[PDB]
Amino acid sequence: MKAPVRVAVTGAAGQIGYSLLFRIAAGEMLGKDQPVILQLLEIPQAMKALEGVVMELEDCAFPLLAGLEATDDPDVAFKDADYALLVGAAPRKAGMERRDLLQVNGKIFTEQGRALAEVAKKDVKVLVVGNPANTNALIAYKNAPGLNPRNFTAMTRLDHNRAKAQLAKKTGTGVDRIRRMTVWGNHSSTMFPDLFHAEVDGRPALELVDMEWYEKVFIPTVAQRGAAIIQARGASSAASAANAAIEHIRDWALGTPEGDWVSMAVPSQGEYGIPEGIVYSFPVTAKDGAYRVVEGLEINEFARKRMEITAQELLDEMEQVKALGLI
Amino acid sequence: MKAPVRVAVTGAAGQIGYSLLFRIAAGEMLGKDQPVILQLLEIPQAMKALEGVVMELEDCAFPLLAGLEATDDPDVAFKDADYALLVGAAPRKAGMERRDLLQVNGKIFTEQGRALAEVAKKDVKVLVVGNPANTNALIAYKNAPGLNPRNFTAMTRLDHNRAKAQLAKKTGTGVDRIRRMTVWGNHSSTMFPDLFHAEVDGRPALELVDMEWYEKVFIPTVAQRGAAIIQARGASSAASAANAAIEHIRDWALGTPEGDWVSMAVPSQGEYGIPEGIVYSFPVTAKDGAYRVVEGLEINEFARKRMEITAQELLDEMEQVKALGLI
């Protein structure tokens, strides 16, 4: 019964995309009753590898894959998109300093913002994965004249899932019984995973673990997790990032569980006193494609301090891009 | 929910394993109500990386992942196993020659065949993916005294799905309308993809395509497809091989669709006059854990000759293995 939706994914020949695309086509992201047309974007040099990804997608004979198209032009890839996962971002190069990274990313995200605004559906749902996620999402929405800024979000869901995984291990309880986890702020080393409102099988988290653990063990362990993976495997965590991307879109489109909320970085409207405009991770619920920040939670001194440190980081980054005349 | 099954996977830190494990844990192979316990095996030098893969699986927060254990000991990995996916095989090493390759695999598959017989469930279902899969499955079942040899299979489902894909492409019809594809024989260049019994949206395949296209274009192109992917991406077809492994287990454990069949390489019991013993791909249907070869199809001359050629190849390989004292 359902007509196909079109899903645009950039950086599609890269490792996150190689773990992402196959599960999207299998129906994991939007439902096993919803056929998808994948519109994939790569830079010109990676187009040959993209063709080989396309042949592997064909070789899975996915009944929900209603169409497949690969391109290096953003205006083709975003054409009529329902959803856009913006994974591709500037690579690190030698002696390429910070501002140099900002500039290159600024150009990609400006151009992509523009294209979305010109050819996508006006209600396109956008997720930015490529680093620095939050600031890239800011440059994209700011350059996307005529689209709702709230349809541009950045991914903190991998940090959120890591946090739940560590709390589960510590309390010896199944990860499916952890609820109300929140990661606030930037996707960076200043992010704040908040246990003050989390529950472990009905019980408040902080009745099961102590503050010392929290501050000296859990926080630095969630923060260092991506580096732990690279040390062990020799490669970054693509499969678990792809899984977090699928979850962020799926829970936004299909809704969050009753009684629960997820973390999403979205353009702040001043919730919790956070400065307007920056893309900041809040606790959110979603229903039928729209989300709402969870307000009213009580914020103690420990959380406030942390929430502000991370907001300030984002404000400085935004200061940088502005100075570069990017927004 | 059902009670958890134990799934053992070898070569778990390799490429096919990195694409396989997350979809298994997600519920794609045995259903969304069946929790799984993953028992992962690697050689000792890849244990560090396997720990990094373990961490990414934790970080997915999967609700059906009821346990996860990594080991370098087969008797640990296979313990109480309900399913065993034998992905890891002898790597190619320089100057290493055929029979050399044969010996190194011979060592792997005997010790594995042995661990499974000592410690897995008696009804353990075994899928061999590592090359040469058909002959590897022969070594393992021959060395797994006590287990039903028919619970030992090899994967030809990737060839089967590639064939479905090319036919859908040629006829311009969706892949979901293609039924009754069969890939007979070895997972090698002598595989025989059979269009004689296939149906495209209800019509026999050969009313839509001609014999010349079939023999000049379709057969060689399905056989070369693994090479095309390597030449395009620079790496082999891990994600689509991981999908075909999931489908192979899924359709055997859950069941094939009505009026349809799948390809699986199983120990020959003389079906179609195929020599006994060798692990040969046939058309099969399956219901709730057991399969049956589809018998009584009409085999014309064009098909028999090809069935024969790939049958001979396998007979010869088995000869080699026996000569090496492996079975």
Ligand SMILES: NC(=O)c1ccc[n+]([C@@H]2O[C@H](COP(=O)([O-])OP(=O)(O)OC[C@H]3O[C@@H](n4cnc5c(N)ncnc54)[C@H](O)[C@@H]3O)[C@@H](O)[C@H]2O)c1
């Ligand atoms: N937010 C998060 O949690 C999180 C987690 C991990 C990684 N990431 C980010 O994901 C991004 C991609 O990661 P990866 O591991 O796949 O890298 P990768 O290098 O394997 O792939 C990145 C891909 O980006 C493509 N790309 C670059 N510019 C592009 C453009 N203008 N149009 C389309 N495609 C383009 C490249 O060609 C490459 O295929 C990185 O920025 C990384 O830091 C974010």
Ligand SMILES: NC(=O)c1ccc[n+]([C@@H]2O[C@H](COP(=O)([O-])OP(=O)(O)OC[C@H]3O[C@@H](n4cnc5c(N)ncnc54)[C@H](O)[C@@H]3O)[C@@H](O)[C@H]2O)c1
């Ligand atoms: N049947 C088919 O359709 C099909 C398709 C694709 C690939 N293959 C086979 O897949 C196999 C693995 O492919 P890959 O791309 O993942 O290679 P890879 O090298 O990336 O991974 C293989 C993994 O197996 C591990 N390994 C080696 N010996 C082992 C043992 N004794 N026990 C446990 N692990 C062991 C390695 O350490 C490595 O981690 C190859 O033999 C390839 O020929 C078969």
